User: Fold this.
Amino acid sequence: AGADEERAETARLSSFIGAIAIGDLVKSTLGPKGMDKILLSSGRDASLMVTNDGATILKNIGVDNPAAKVLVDMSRVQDDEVGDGTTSVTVLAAELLREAESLIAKKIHPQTIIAGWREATKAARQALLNSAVDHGSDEVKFRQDLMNIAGTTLSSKLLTHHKDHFTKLAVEAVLRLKGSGNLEAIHVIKKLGGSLADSYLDEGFLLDKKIGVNQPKRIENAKILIANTGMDTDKIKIFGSRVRVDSTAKVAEIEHAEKEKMKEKVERILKHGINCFINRQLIYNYPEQLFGAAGVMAIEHADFVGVERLALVTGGEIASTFDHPELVKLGSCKLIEEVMIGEDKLIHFSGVALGEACTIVLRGATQQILDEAERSLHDALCVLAQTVKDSRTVYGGGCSEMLMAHAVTQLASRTPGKEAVAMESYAKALRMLPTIIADNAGYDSADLVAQLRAAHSEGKTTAGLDMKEGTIGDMSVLGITESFQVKRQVLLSAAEAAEVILRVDNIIKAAPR
Amino acid sequence: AGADEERAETARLSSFIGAIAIGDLVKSTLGPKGMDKILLSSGRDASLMVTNDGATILKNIGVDNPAAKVLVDMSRVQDDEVGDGTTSVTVLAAELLREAESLIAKKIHPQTIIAGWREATKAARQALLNSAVDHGSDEVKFRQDLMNIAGTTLSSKLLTHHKDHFTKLAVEAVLRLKGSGNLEAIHVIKKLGGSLADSYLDEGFLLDKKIGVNQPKRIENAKILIANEIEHAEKEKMKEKVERILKHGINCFINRQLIYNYPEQLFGAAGVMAIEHADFVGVERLALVTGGEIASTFDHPELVKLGSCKLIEEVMIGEDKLIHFSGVALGEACTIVLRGATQQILDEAERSLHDALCVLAQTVKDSRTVYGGGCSEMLMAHAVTQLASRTPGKEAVAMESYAKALRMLPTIIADNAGYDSADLVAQLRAAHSEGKTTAGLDMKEGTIGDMSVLGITESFQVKRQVLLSAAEAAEVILRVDNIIKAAPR
Amino acid sequence: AGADEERAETARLSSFIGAIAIGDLVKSTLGPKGMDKILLSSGRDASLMVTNDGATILKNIGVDNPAAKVLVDMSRVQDDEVGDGTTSVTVLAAELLREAESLIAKKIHPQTIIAGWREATKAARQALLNSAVDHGSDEVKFRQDLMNIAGTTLSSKLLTHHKDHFTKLAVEAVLRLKGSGNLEAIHVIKKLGGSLADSYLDEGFLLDKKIGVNQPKRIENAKILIANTGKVAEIEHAEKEKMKEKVERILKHGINCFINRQLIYNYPEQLFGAAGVMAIEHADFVGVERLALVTGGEIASTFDHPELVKLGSCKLIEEVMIGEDKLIHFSGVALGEACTIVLRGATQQILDEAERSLHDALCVLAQTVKDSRTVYGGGCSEMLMAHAVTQLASRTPGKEAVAMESYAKALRMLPTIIADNAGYDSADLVAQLRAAHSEGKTTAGLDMKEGTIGDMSVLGITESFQVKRQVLLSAAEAAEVILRVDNIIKAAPR
Amino acid sequence: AGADEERAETARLSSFIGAIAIGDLVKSTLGPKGMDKILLSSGRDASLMVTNDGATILKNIGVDNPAAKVLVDMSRVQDDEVGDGTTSVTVLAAELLREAESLIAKKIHPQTIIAGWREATKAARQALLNSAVDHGSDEVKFRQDLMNIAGTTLSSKLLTHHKDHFTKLAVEAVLRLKGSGNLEAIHVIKKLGGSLADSYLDEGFLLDKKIGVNQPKRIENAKILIANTIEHAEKEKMKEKVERILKHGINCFINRQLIYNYPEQLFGAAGVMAIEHADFVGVERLALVTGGEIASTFDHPELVKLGSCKLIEEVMIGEDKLIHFSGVALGEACTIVLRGATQQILDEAERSLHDALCVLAQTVKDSRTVYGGGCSEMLMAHAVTQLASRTPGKEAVAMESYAKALRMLPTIIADNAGYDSADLVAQLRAAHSEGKTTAGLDMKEGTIGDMSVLGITESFQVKRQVLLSAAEAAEVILRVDNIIKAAPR
Assistant:
């Protein structure tokens, strides 16, 4: 229905603007020294969200009328099977649109010009088939656990002054996460406190809640209880109305009935040896006095998301009415205690025998810049899982992009008529990436492009863009690598719909309405 | 990736503006001629708040959209580590920003410039291991007890004309408080009735409050009580209080909260003085002093209560109504009562004692100090200026910008003095360059003098943490564009 | 009034806008189906200037507030040593400005980038003497003399249907032109039309004036006279004496024609008709200047001026029927140093293109003699250079490369433009064009009649070698002045 | 009547704005990689002039309400004395205004800072002490005649791809000039044609006028006549001209004004070439060249006239006809003609050339120069930082700020080069600090190199008064709210 009318030229233009606007923000993000973008919104979110991951912020927000959301949505599928590394895929697609302005001069058949996607099928071929990636990544592995690909993802991120160490920590997390058991139950939070480590590794799941001022400080061989239904009692489905009774004698039983709820909770809780209770909602006051005497620590209004992960962690339980204790519930038993961390007080669940689920706690300076660690971390978890079993990678720092560009230029001219025009335009698309990496490093982009091309042309796939250097250097020494799937999936997506429809290269434009 | 957006140079300006606004308000705060600031704002605050301490005022309010609050929060961690000293750390960070106007001339990636912070680390340790300055503070101590750091914290506040004598007194308070346990039993009030001595020292505890208009004027052999059918029930509650009370001879009751009206009538007829809403901080202190009490329900009287009976009375000192607890047998905890000349500077004395207890605990443990009055700042500034020219590429514009930031502290210290700031900067630099570590800014002088003779010294913990913290403050400028919130609209 | 405050980005923008507006107008002017532009202004402009030659109209006027008059001025110096072919220099300079938006993206300093133009100048020269071409233009040359560049230069002009023939004629003019003097004394005027030939070549100078309807139709063994200077009864008698002096001196000489650059007195007019002598009133001074070198000239004084003090060439002077209209012919000059070129046309006031097409035409083949060097036409040169220049950007150490590569892709538009107007799809054309050029055959080019690609040499199209060397050096620098200048100091009442 | 209202601080701003507006156009111009600008205007202006010399363009126009024209006017006194080389004097004065924003922050006495100018004079000697000038320029000078300052003057001008060769030519022009009388008898015109040399040096004077269509093409053993000035009477003027003229053998006549038609017919038959409306300035120079003559009424022929004869002819050069006067016996006065590669930038030659004539003459007379490429400026910068610490009171703050001003110049010279500015600044500082006055910014290299090997040096005078002018301009805009003077050209 209604509003927003666009056709042919004007409609093509809307696609054009969306690609250029996104490219500049993502432009600072790529390579060993990127920049931080900080966002504040109104009416649906709490505060300032800062993300160095182009994928994370894009998924969350659809700011305006121009089209770009659908292109953005696709990158997530990429994350599930490979994703990140560094966010470069969005940039390649955007630059495709710049050539379109020179096409109107031609003024006849973009479709004839378009001969290129079949030609760009070649990109699926040339970009990720020539150059020997990586191989072993044995298992657990001493030295090769990190100090390579995680570091590159982080280098593009500003926090590398101390976060390079954080990245190193993440693979330790993946080692426990490898084997059989699914990609689930990984929890991470950041703490407002400065230390050299800037992060702490827990033996289990971290939660931030307390029963009250009273109750024992620490429990051992802990039994964990999770209830779906609240502790609160009174109304029931049918009120039974608020009653009055024939004398003061029968009003007493009602108060007495309250005591019975108290009775059930302690009598069978004691047999279990219950050390901790976690409830996701409001908690009734009566049990609270009881738990302190028993020596049981309960958690008021515990977050549901923490709870679901916790069930996987402790073998779980079936949560229903107060019958829920004993056998229906399973409780792991290493150590549960509330421990002060840097400055804040946190409760630590640890020693889960099953081992499938684990939690990582980050620590920091207390800056917005610190919130950067949250954005980088999310990026890192996805990067390592894919690196371990994809058994395939490419040289980073734009090494791959310059090589393909040299190869694609040859393709133009070699093909005779009709075929040649789009293939060269596709070819120039590789050139902007070298420019994007250099500009964010504070070095003159013009000077950098010229010197960059000569090293790639020579045949060293290892050589690439070194931002700290300001010129060109050996990418491999740095340990900068991109996963094979991230590069492979994007080229097909760019040349997917593009092929068959207007069957060839220089896409999209609008259709009906 | 958008919100409220400004890019590179405009983005830089939002951080740039926040630092300059804070520096001017805080500059007048520092040293002997510093001045008190008062704030008034609409809704959810009341009216006049006056905070001499820069840290306390910044923490309380997030006034506007431009970023600065996160930078503000960090000073508190520093406060916990050692505390106040003199407020100077916020100021260094602000002047760092002015150089950034010239960083556009550098013309490269600002993150790349950030290497200067590492360079700042060189500045951080140049200050360190150069000029050992202190050895001492064994415990109690005959002559090193004061005329030192307490005097410098007090230097910031104009009370120093007679106050420095009072601050000498404060370490005596600390010596009694370092042992036995806690950080309790210290209370300070001011009275109007000026004399040269300006302070006494109460062995007991001093409190300002009254039961009500009725009740006996004075109590002797005083005993102290401290406490942590419906219609019919209330009468019994009254009755239990009187029955237990009469046998004891109960002279005074102190309760840390609101007090129910029924008992009030009974206390008047009985001849018992009670205190409504007594502050908790005073109450804990009283317990150590009186031998303590077991505070619980109305069973609290007799044996579970230990009472000190020298004398409790409401005493007129000078003018204002106050109640004096004295004659404590323990002697471990005391209250210092200082008499002033009747000015805000008299209220100024309130924060001088707080400042003194904290220093000695930290000063004994660190075993290190630095010269105060900006002595360290010019010396460090002299060392840092050389570093900028020496370092290549990226480092040189950034290195001197941090070095430059040391210069304002000398300027801030004397601007509030009443002397011309421009003249002060040149003269200061010449003495530090020459090689005298002891030499520093003398505000009373208007020029430079020997800091050690004053006795002004600064705790080692305040200096090490600020420099690492400062780097983070300089670390949140240009790289961050806008990005507003922490507290409701 | 005082106003118009602009700085930094806004000042750059004024430069940006001037380049974009000009490029669209000059855009269809390149190649076989170029578009006719007609432009008029009040005052002394006159009437008919319809401009297909981009350089000619731009040079003539400076109509509006934005700054671009100076960039336009620069193209003419190029024109004097070579100029045209097709007007492409302005287009290439204009497209460079688009990257200026990316300059703020580079966010450092624009001056570092402009050094690329110097480099571009080197790029211009390394795109000149390497990556070969035709190696023809021996001298005189019976078949390669034309039907070449002019055909392509003419291609941008509509009149190509009968004008391509005209174009062939123009090199004959250069063959006589080459030698002792320089590029001097060449005059050409269109005379609408009505003949298959569409042009007659005059062995001498062309003139267009008549004394009056009466007077002898033809003169032979003609002596030419050019003069700088234009009892009451005896006064009347004295007038007769002026008549007498003019006749007495005239008959002995045999004077066949008189030409004067000013008003002529009525009394002598009757005399000339009876004698058998034709006179010209208010003949243009410029025509006379050209004529003096040609005929050996004379000394122009008072009536003593006839006989020996004046020299009169005597081949043939006549008024002849040219297709339809009458135009005077001065011809058969012994010296041979200076000549006159005459052309015609279909007549749609698009023929007037020939008035300025010709201005570009005049310089190009005169130049061809001097160069003894030429390049393949039909855009053959542009595709070859484009293939070579793409490699060249990486060949340079840096700085040079960024500007050189952008410059390289600029060449792509010209092949597109040549076939775009041709009535064929540009997209198919650009790809097929490159394959033949990359192959190694320099003779391959845009075959516009064909609609595809073919042997340019077979068609017979070549461009003056100078047009390519100067244009490349000139284009980069003409482009540089608008981009490098941020903030032009002014004051604009308007 | 009333539209714009300004007071004190905003008044400073109007003055502030003028310095920034001028600085952006001028900065591009400075150093070996500068730019050229074109101005249209209207009324009493023939056509747009494009000026590279900051001094020439500012003198010629007073475009708007803000006051800057007077600041501009002073630079010319500097130019007659020396001036040029590169226009940097105006830029440096402009950058001192930026500190003024800092100054309101100071919030004290604005003129207290004014002491810094006195200090600036101290700063000026500071460069002299800390840089090695030159050891020679003893007249004529076999290799150091050029390939130094002219190269720097010209390098700032892009045209140096081929024009560096013409820059070399200009000193030869000054060497003949040095001697007996002031700055006169030098004529130079650009020509629209292409050649490798890009210019020709003429021993005589070049002119561009023609008698008429008729008249002999060429004259030899030429006699030259210069003039400062019913029907039957007209014939007599014709008679005197021919009779007297024939005896002398008269080959050419040059008249500075309109010429009567009757003689024109005579000259053609006689075989004499005359010039109508010849420019007086060309004539005066020509007279010195040919030995001159006494110009009066028609009694002017014979001995009162002295004519030199080598060759006078009209020659085709490129596309435009000009007349060449050549073979002067005196040799004292000469004319320079330059061609080059054409465009807008060739009208530039009239502009660039004016600058060239001024720099080279100075080089022979001064016998003093300093190393170019910014070598002088960085070394002064290393030197400037130490002095500020030493100077008492007012002087330290102002001397240091003046001192860091010099840092930007290395950055601007490098920036136009086309190389990374950040890397360049620090490396430059290291070479100067060591003690090599020769080392400087090698823009072509992209890094620091030995300036002396290049051969580039700057005239000593340009440096002496730039510092003094910069200081008066630096005394600046802060002073008076209105300045104005003159009605030029």
